[model samples]
Target: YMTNGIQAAVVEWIRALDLEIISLLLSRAWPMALLATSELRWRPTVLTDTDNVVRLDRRQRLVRWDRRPPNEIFLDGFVPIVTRENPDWEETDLYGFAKNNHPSIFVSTTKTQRNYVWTPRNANRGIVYQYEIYAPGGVDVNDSFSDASPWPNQMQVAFPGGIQNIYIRSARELHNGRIQRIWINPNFLDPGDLEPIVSSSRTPQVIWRMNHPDGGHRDQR
Candidate 1:
């Protein structure tokens, strides 16, 4: 399962915030930087009790309005690249090679005469992999998001980017000769915005890609 998929993690984060406050802050803040740079100043002040307080002042005036300062506020917040129990499957060397060599839709598990297949663009060998995603038993085969469903129980792969096809017959023949198979698409997977799982060093870099090229001019390059 892609714990770091934008749909899985990114959208959930946005849902937690007040859209009105977000819009208001965006309008008041600069596009590239959030805090008011010109009016923003950070200094340590000693109070009567000699306790130091860090203040952020803007334009010689303290911009205080029952609002959280930039440091205290995190718009998008952070999503860890790795998840506990089920890490990212792409980290495995076998899976890495398979994903890179095979088409995004190629068959993955092969049996003697039949193969229970599912496309894992980043998965190699092994059914009991810790990084792969699976849905809990009783989840709807066609349902992506179910409040009652426990994820990481059914193997999951994003469409058009991570994996795209599953040959059920081949899969059963390969895995204990069982024919029961279920593949559920994610509730929200955007092909155009599809990207590899986000890691610590890679997240900020991904957000950087979202920044518009100053009027879209190459001369600035």
Candidate 2:
């Protein structure tokens, strides 16, 4: 890092002095830096009480170009169910636009009404779930499942059309294998709603395999 100097001599002197100090400083600090950062790793997304995510708000960051004071905003993880209806949020700032697009799901309160003014789209009102297919988790720990779920019409399971539904409205396989993401509308659909369906769809059943002889961490063949 160089600083603006009044003249060349001062700059040269400072550079000569910093070169040795910087080299020694790097050797002493680099390994400790690596050790500290290794503890910070976590899975792709979600802000739960389990992760010490809130601790970071107290730390120092950004050596330059940091214009704003500390504030909370959602980033690459699912939020707890919000009860409010759809938003009137406009991306006035480019940064705010990117934050929501990080692809995190904000599972709001499950819908419970007909197609009146209050009923929001399935993606907005439904629940988002992250599940695993294989015993060994192969999903990437990034915001890989950020895209909006598929439309309800495209996949009936993605939404509730039956008398009521634990219905999924949209689901997409992400770039990685094993991890599956689905948007679910838990509210059962009444017969009166404008939609098509033949009986309640079969909910996929999961059998628990606890204490397998070959554990989840075993090498995949």
Candidate 3:
């Protein structure tokens, strides 16, 4: 006798569905279902105007500083999962130098004809530097230069600004020389009501079509 009404109903439904039906449902629904059940959440901390914004790499494990900003004054949204595992990640950046701090998450940077610039208004303005990722195992991931041996996991910023965009460009000769661009909102300063800032050409329907042949649609809310 199940005391909880919802639990009892779930049991009854489980009994009614066959294994094949249940498997199909789970396979189709698992991706969207996990979005609602994720334990990891973005917890942002506003850094001082002199502090840099930090972000986890694509895998969301290794953290790195956003050296693009002329003035390091930016915001950081760090997940506890990564922070707890690597406590030294933040400490090693500011060793005894209290004036400066480590960066977190992502931010918007200005762009020109050939390169991108991170010019913070006021005293924060500085020279435009090449983008790089400080990954684990002493791996140097740079965006400006090329190497004789190719790196398969190469991510490039397709567009820089309000809604930062990036794309994976591992193979130049395949798929029009670039993979799909992902748009992310650089609103780490305000996380209470955060929403993704994507391009006007992209929408829920367009994304659905990319994966599903039926061309279905689902409301993000």
Candidate 4:
């Protein structure tokens, strides 16, 4: 029986090795250009501090109410409008949040696997956007809107981008026991009144593919 500390260390070591392998695969097989590097921005509305006093022509405006043999005076008020010149004044980076606030697609360079994560910006939070994933053999999957946040607001596919038939037994068996080659493309519907952000297209990327402890079966069998 392995001790808890030993098990934890093993897990940590596996995670480190996985990260290194992913980094190496991305460096050599994936295109750096396919990754999104730009910062996303959105405008925010703020309320002014001024109270119920209205000012006009550099002077405070007074409201007069006519009454029977008397009159009431009150101060007229106006709401001040403040607009931010830079939309990103209070905006934070996507990576700052626990979950990505923008849409992104990732693919495995070694096999027919892909994952898509979508997070609408604050401005587009309530609005729904259509999306589609197309595979190589006229296979397609469509979805809309992420269910929740900071979690599985993502979709993962085993075989993506029309690479269904490329492998003989499995993706691993075809490429000399290595990951199979795959590509992924993500498309979003019309912006309409929503923020117009472009989703990334992935070419060979790194993914974690699980294999059976025992030998895997053949595709023809």
Candidate 5:
């Protein structure tokens, strides 16, 4: 009865769900951590230090690194998939490298013929997605890429499998105990939509959608 890659153990565990909550935590090993534990009741009054706390790229969904203080760092809650950048160490796009390491079930135009691809062990490449770490205090939100700068912390999910959706949840503490959920739709990346290149294995892509209860805030999450 083991088919569709759904093992008996996995099916049993998933069937135990309440059914009310259709969604399930794909990977529960890692949970988001709280950034700060202080309770600040003060309202927005004056410019405390005239320093921008954080700079987020609304377009790329990339959290820029400006600065960080001691005793503070970034953490990884989300996972990422990756693949080889190039077969011969040549130049490659970022997306290919991102999908190779992360394993996922993918679909193709012809089911009979294998269309999905996985990263090769000898490809000389690796990928990971997680929350980046950085020093706290005196952290400036203007610093660019550097060894001392912060980086993203995410898990890696590979491709060439049958994965269709990505589940995203808030890893940080939110105000008023409100839950933050985001989804990336599968249609986000279509292989046929990518630009043609010399390499046939460079078209790996993925996408997800956010399940917004309020249906208000839905963007790169």
Candidate 6:
């Protein structure tokens, strides 16, 4: 009984907030010396982050969403990157919980060959790491966003840049055999977009309006 690929840790990229600040850099046609800049940031989703209103309840095999109205809902499209060595089957300990709302999905227990399979692990979790992201200057001269280990690290970016890749490695690599890298995909990028999950829960939008709100001027009164 065995599963092929599993991920101990994952990294991601995001375009959070449509904050098109970078567009200005391109429009200006600035010189290569001093360029416009942006950032690549990564925060962890761990067991200790208990204050989270949204999380994956691995035990219940469901996604829970319990957010306060005043709070802004999730909308970060984080694109993930791979970071692992294959044939080293170390079980990952990643988890989350809503303790409240809904958007459930099952996270089934994994099975693998000749490995210490899942046990009473319904209460333990691991995979603590630090990270760094590499780009032009960093990739060319030095490394940017250098932190400890265990990461989906963040990097400051700029124009005249085309490629970037985030890196994440286990703080503690206890080699077993061959390990397969894995991440849940777009789910990690943008976790909460509750629209498709629930129906009739339409998000309100301001369709049309004049410069001033005179109850719509009532036909120019």
Best by TM-score: 3
lDDT of model 2, residue 216? 24
**RMSD in Å for model 2:** 23.6
- Candidate 3: global Cα-lDDT? 0.21
Model 4 TM-score, 2 decimals: 0.15
Residue 194 Cα positional deviation in candidate 2, in Å, after optimal superposition: 5.4
Clashes found in each candidate (C-alpha, N, C closer than 3 A): 17, 11, 8, 6, 56, 17
Residue 212, candidate 6: Cα error in Å is 27
Query: lDDT by residue for model 2 over 35-111, one digit each (tens)?
Result: 34422111222222122332111010101001111110001111212212232232111112223322211111121
Task: Tell me the deviation in Å of residue 23 in model 4.
Answer: 8.5
Question: Which of 3 and 5 is the better model by lDDT?
Answer: 3
lDDT of 3 by residue, 1-221 (tens): 11111111112343344434322322232234433442111112211111233322221122122322211111111111111222333322211111132331112121211212232333222222222211111111122112311221322211101111121101001112221322122322221222233234532212211223322111123
After aligning candidate 5 to the native by TM-score, how far in Å is the CA of 130 from where it should be? Answer: 23
Query: What are the TM-scores, per candidate, against the unseen true structure?
Result: 0.15, 0.15, 0.17, 0.15, 0.17, 0.15
- Alpha carbon lDDT of residue 73, candidate 4? 8
Of candidate 1, the 10-residue stretch with the lowest lDDT total is 57-66
Per-residue CA lDDT of candidate 5, range 68-121, in tens? 111111111121222222112211111223323223221111010111222223
Alpha carbon lDDT of each predicted model: 0.21, 0.19, 0.21, 0.19, 0.20, 0.18
Tens digit per residue, CA lDDT, model 4, 1-221: 11111111111222233323322321232224423332111111121112433222111111111110100000111101111222231121122121332311111111111222332233122212121221211001111112321243332221111111111111111222232222111111121332222233432422212332222222231
